[PDB]
Write a protein that binds this ligand. Structure first.
Ligand code: 5Y6
Lengths: 266, 344
């Protein structure tokens, strides 16, 4: 609820809506090792790790989403070789959990969650157990906060989506499907490139198309750039074709070995 | 597994607090929050003073995390501004840089109260009140409660570009589950003393009413002698001042968890010759003045009948001569001393 109406003067909007061409220029560092295709498969993979960590810890979706955005912001600026993403994922959950006020994730419960999720749900990708102890989380935490320029409040599409479906008066029919599409958009770069309400709007439109709901005049009655909303729809429709043609479980061991490795100290 | 080149690059470029600021011997505060210093910039780009707070403890606690999160977003003239955050990796200490505020209401009120035996600019009180209301309104519009408003936290800028502007500070950023259930109680709303489960905008507005009455009289309105939320003697003073609340004045008081304790401990008839009219009349504030009427709306016992900050700013008290000024000192010479330094 805190800062709900301050988006247009927020640190999210003023620093962390990136230019697409700047994003891909910094990405070229890792594209010497990975293909563009392999790079998004890695992005999809680690969005699922962070999601699994969140479910295990019983965190609400918005906390999980702030965590995912911390992870995306870090690797948008820096190489995959800089900090092991296996360390960064639980660090992002840890920090995100601490920004919200209702409850705290303890040290032993964080480490036990990382250990258990990787062994039980991700043993296709990881043969060895989670090797990092809590002091590795605490050290990584300092670098993460510092790289994000202490920007912790993150706006998500869930809140505007709820307001839009309530406005249509079709909460029962459309909200479960549309909410699930917002979840899926975190598999892409969309949260680094568009304001949350536009992502919300694109997800609602796709929900209406799938369920054959005619919301043409309701969408016309909005005052917003539709061309940009169309750009998001195309990213969402392409993500489902990516999903179809991608066997995460069969491919991700090989792709994680192609990742550039952190150089040790000589 | 952390890349070495990435590591030493960041270690080379990292701004360290001890290189950037002179603060040796310039400690001006020490408490549960940590240690505050009056700092000056070593690479002399400006000659401004800054407040340097080393946060209590190590790492990033929930308190630290939320203070950084919210201050990183908040921006209003009457709320204190976080200029920068230093993370010291070796000792794991967090430093926050702020604009330096020479005075506060605790030190100002204490100076007048001290000199009264052994509010000199006209319109100072009103200006302080309006700016306190303007700041708190900005927070409340962003669903940020303060949760611990008091004269020590209402800061006032000294000589410089922001001369006499109020700066709210020390927001209660971390409270578990937004709960007061998880020592002085003079600024605490009666619902908190009756076991209210959660902080509210109204609880803050009550605090503002107490401060206001303190600015007008130089005494804390609900002053009291020194775990659980119920405090008998604190409630006794509120009743001596305000009267005991009639059933019609606060219908929902029966819903409060400590209501039956109140009934057991207190009798209405004890406070029959007690009202805010009578208290303020003894301290030479007129009960027909617009200043008194606004106060009574702020110091309303039932939380649902307390005015909001946005309605308080709109009061005709602020349209009566003298008008509120941006400089609370009204361009006049500031007769208060600077902050004394401290030891370690
Ligand atoms: C001696 N006192 C001093 C000293 C300095 C200052 C001061 C001067 N300028 C800017 C700032 Cl941000 C200052 N703060 C306010 C915020 C605070 C640190 C000190 C206090 N609680 C906290 O969590 O952070 C205030 C006060 C009131 S006091 O009576 O406690």
């Amino acid at each position: 609820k805190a800062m709900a109406g301050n988006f247009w003067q927020s640190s999210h909007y003023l620093q962390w809506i990136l230019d697409k061409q700047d994003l891909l220029k910094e990405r070229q560092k890792d594209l010497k090792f990975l293909s563009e295709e392999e790079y998004w498969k890695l992005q999809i993979f680690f969005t699922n790790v962070i999601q699994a960590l969140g479910e295990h810890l019983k965190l609400r979706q918005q906390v999980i989403a702030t965590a995912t955005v911390y992870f995306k912001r870090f690797y948008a600026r820096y190489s995959l070789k800089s900090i092991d993403p296996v360390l960064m994922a639980p660090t992002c959950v840890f920090l995100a959990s601490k920004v919200e006020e209702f409850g705290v994730v303890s040290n032993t419960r964080l480490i036990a969650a990382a250990t258990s999720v990787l062994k039980t749900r991700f043993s296709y990708a990881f043969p060895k157990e989670f090797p990092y102890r809590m002091n590795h989380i605490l050290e990584c935490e300092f670098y993460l906060l510092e790289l994000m320029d202490c920007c912790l409040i993150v706006y998500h599409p869930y809140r505007p989506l709820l307001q839009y479906v309530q406005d249509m008066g079709q909460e029962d029919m459309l909200l479960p499907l549309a909410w699930r599409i917002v979840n899926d958009t975190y598999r892409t770069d969309l949260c680094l490139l568009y304001p949350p309400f536009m992502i919300a709007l694109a997800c609602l439109h796709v929900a209406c198309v799938v369920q054959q709901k005619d919301a043409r005049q309701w969408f016309a009655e909005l005052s917003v750039d539709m061309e940009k909303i169309l750009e998001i729809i195309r990213v969402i429709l392409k993500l489902y074709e990516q999903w179809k043609n991608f066997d995460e479980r069969k491919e991700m061991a090989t792709i994680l070995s192609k990742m550039p490795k952190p150089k040790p100290p000589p | 597994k952390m890349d070495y080149d990435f590591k030493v690059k960041l270690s080379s470029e990292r701004e360290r607090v001890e290189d950037l600021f002179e603060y040796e011997g310039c400690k001006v505060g020490r408490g549960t929050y940590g240690h505050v210093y009056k700092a000056k910039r070593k690479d002399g780009k400006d000659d401004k003073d800054y407040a340097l707070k080393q946060i209590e403890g190590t790492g990033i606690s929930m308190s630290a995390c939320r203070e950084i999160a919210l201050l990183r977003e908040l921006k209003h003239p009457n709320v204190i501004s976080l200029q920068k955050v230093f993370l010291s990796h070796a000792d794991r200490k967090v430093w926050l840089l702020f604009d330096y505020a020479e005075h506060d209401l605790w030190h100002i009120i204490k100076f007048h109260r001290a000199s009264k035996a052994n509010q000199l600019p006209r319109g100072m009180v009103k200006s302080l009140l309006y700016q306190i209301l303007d700041g708190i309104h900005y927070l409340h519009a962003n669903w940020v409660l303060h949760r611990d408003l008091k004269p020590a936290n209402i800061l006032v800028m000294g000589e410089g570009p922001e001369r006499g502007r109020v700066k709210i500070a020390d927001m209660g950023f971390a409270r578990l589950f937004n709960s007061p259930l998880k020592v002085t109680f003079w600024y605490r709303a009666p619902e908190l003393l009756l076991g209210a489960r959660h902080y509210t905008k109204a609880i803050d507005i009550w605090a503002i009413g107490c401060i206001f009455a303190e600015l007008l009289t130089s005494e804390p309105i609900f002053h009291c002698r020194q775990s659980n939320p119920y405090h008998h003697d604190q409630l006794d003073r509120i009743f001596n001042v305000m009267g005991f609340p009639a059933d019609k004045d606060w219908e929902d008081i029966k819903k409060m968890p400590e209501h039956s304790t109140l009934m057991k401990d207190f009798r209405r008839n004890t406070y029959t010759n007690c009202s805010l009219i009578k208290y303020m009349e003894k301290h030479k504030v007129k009960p027909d003045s617009k200043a008194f009427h606004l106060l009574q709306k702020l110091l309303t016992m039932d939380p649902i009948k307390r005015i909001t900050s946005e309605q308080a700013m709109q009061d005709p008290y602020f349209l009566e001569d003298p008008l509120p000024t941006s400089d609370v000192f009204a361009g006049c010479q500031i007769p208060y001393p600077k902050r004394e330094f401290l030891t370690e």
